[PDB]
Amino acid sequence: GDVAIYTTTSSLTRDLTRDAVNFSTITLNPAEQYQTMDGFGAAITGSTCYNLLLMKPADRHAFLTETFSDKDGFGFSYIRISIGCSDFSLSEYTCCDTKGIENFALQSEEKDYILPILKEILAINPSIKVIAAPWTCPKWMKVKSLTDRTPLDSWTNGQLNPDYYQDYATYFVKWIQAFKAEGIDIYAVTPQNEPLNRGNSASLYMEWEEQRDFVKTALGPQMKAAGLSTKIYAFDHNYNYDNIESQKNYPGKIYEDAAASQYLAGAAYHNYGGNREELLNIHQAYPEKELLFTETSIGTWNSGRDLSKRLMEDMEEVALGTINNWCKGVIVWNLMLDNDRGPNREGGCQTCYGAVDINNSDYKTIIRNSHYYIIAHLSSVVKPGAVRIATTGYTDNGITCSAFENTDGTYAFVLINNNEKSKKITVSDGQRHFAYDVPGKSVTSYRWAK
Ligand SMILES: OC[C@H]1O[C@@H](OC[C@H]2NC[C@H](O)[C@@H](O)[C@@H]2O)[C@H](O)[C@@H](O)[C@@H]1O
């Protein structure tokens, strides 16, 4: 028909099911434009790659096509990877574990896992955006703290030695360049994953003052001098700033220093603490700066495998909730973990599930979890370059939505009906109209031509 539809229900009566209706209230107002959208997706971790590589090649490629193809799938369009290890790598490591930045090289995990998978994904989707972050700097760039500047031989904790700001900037540059030599353009970085976390299996503490100085004196100058167009997003942690008074408004503080801010596209957030309302505060205070949602997880702590508990809440808070608070993109954590929540690392998340889970006896049977749905419901109809546009018509209980216009002149609409009852909706673009009974506890995505 005229309007293409995707539906998933909490109960799995519909499972990204396809429908269509023809033309025959929520009214889209394309003259009222908000942010443009970069993409949506998941993390391609070492553990994700390991699981994918253990599948039969054709099954892996089918899954990757379904996930990442625009024409043959859901068109996931943003992925996140780690610079060096994360807690879903096959070891603790960095790309320069031997002291001296002259020792920089991509390691076995990149050569054997990350690069082969990303090359397969790029074969399917050559315009996919990649954002990266380190979980730790090389251990030898660490100090115990900024007031105790002695070495710290730890994959976790510590702060970046100010004497190594210039060499660590060089680290980022060599990494980006090595990926480029392999055929992969890095679209964006952050300076550190979750810089207020000292825990995990790999970490580095970095306050806003350190990040400001690192960006303005080393990372921003060096990336620009290398001719890289890679964007830099600040922060990359939770809405509450982990309840550390000094660290509140983390990116805002950095934006106030004009020398740092000139290198920053915006700020990145996760939702592991605090309330997504924070995104609105930051946008209002600095409308010139971008916002991107870069990590959330499902796991044993939030019944991650029970879609009846997760679909509605995750679509409301992670997907539509961030996009309606100015975020240009939404990226979840591990695309694929096995049914044992792995492979994982001692001290890292050992309670996490994947956006999908794969069975580790056959490496074939895959179960989609809430994260796969929330993203596919976005990426299936909202393509890169889409601009979020206003809606008018009546505020209804349990109903949330978002509307966009894609650069190909197609409108896209995504709607959550968090009510047991179906609801009859009617949708207008001003010239054309369509109606659809939206099932209870559903997400529905719609796309049609202007
Ligand atoms: O807070 C919920 C749980 O999060 C688990 O961490 C998951 C991911 N979160 C942030 C980090 O950037 C990732 O490396 C990490 O895998 C955490 O392990 C668990 O203790 C929490 O209960």
Residue numbers in the entry: 37 to 60, 69 to 494
Paper quotes:
Our data show that this locus orchestrates the degradation of 1,6-β-glucan, and this enables B. thetaiotaomicron to utilize this fungal polysaccharide. The critical enzyme encoded by the PUL is BT3312, an endo-1,6-β-glucanase that is displayed on the bacterial surface, allowing direct access to the intact glycan. The enzyme showed no activity on 1,3-β-glucan, 1,4-β-glucan, or 1,6-β-galactan but was active on the 1,6-β-glucan pustulan, producing a range of oligosaccharides in the initial phases of the degradative process. The crystal structure of the endo-1,6-β-glucanase shows that substrate recognition is mediated by shape complementarity of the substrate-binding cleft and the hooked U-shaped conformation of 1,6-β-glucan, rather than through extensive hydrogen-bonding interactions with the polysaccharide.
Thus, to explore the mechanism of catalysis and substrate binding of an endo-1,6-β-glucanase, the crystal structure of BT3312 was determined in complex with the ligand β-glucosyl-1,6-deoxynojirimycin (GlcDNJ). In the ligand complex, unambiguous electron density corresponding to GlcDNJ was evident. The structure of BT3312 bound to GlcDNJ reveals details of the active site and the distal substrate-binding subsites. The Glc at the −2 subsite adopts a relaxed chair (4C1) conformation, whereas DNJ bound in the −1 subsite, the active site, is distorted and adopts a 4E envelope conformation. Within the −1 subsite, the carboxylate of Glu339 and Nδ2 of Asn237 make polar contacts with O2. Binding of GlcDNJ in the active site is also mediated through apolar contacts between the sugar ring and Trp377, which provides the hydrophobic platform in the −1 subsite. The catalytic nucleophile, Glu339, is 3.2 Å from the anomeric carbon of DNJ and is thus in an appropriate position to mount a nucleophilic attack on the anomeric carbon. Glu238 is in an optimal position (3.4 Å) to donate a proton to the glycosidic oxygen appended to C1 and thus is able to function as the acid-base catalyst. The −2 subsite makes only apolar interactions with the Glc in GlcDNJ. Trp345 stacks against the pyranose ring, whereas the disulfide formed by Cys393 and Cys396 also makes apolar contacts with the −2 Glc.
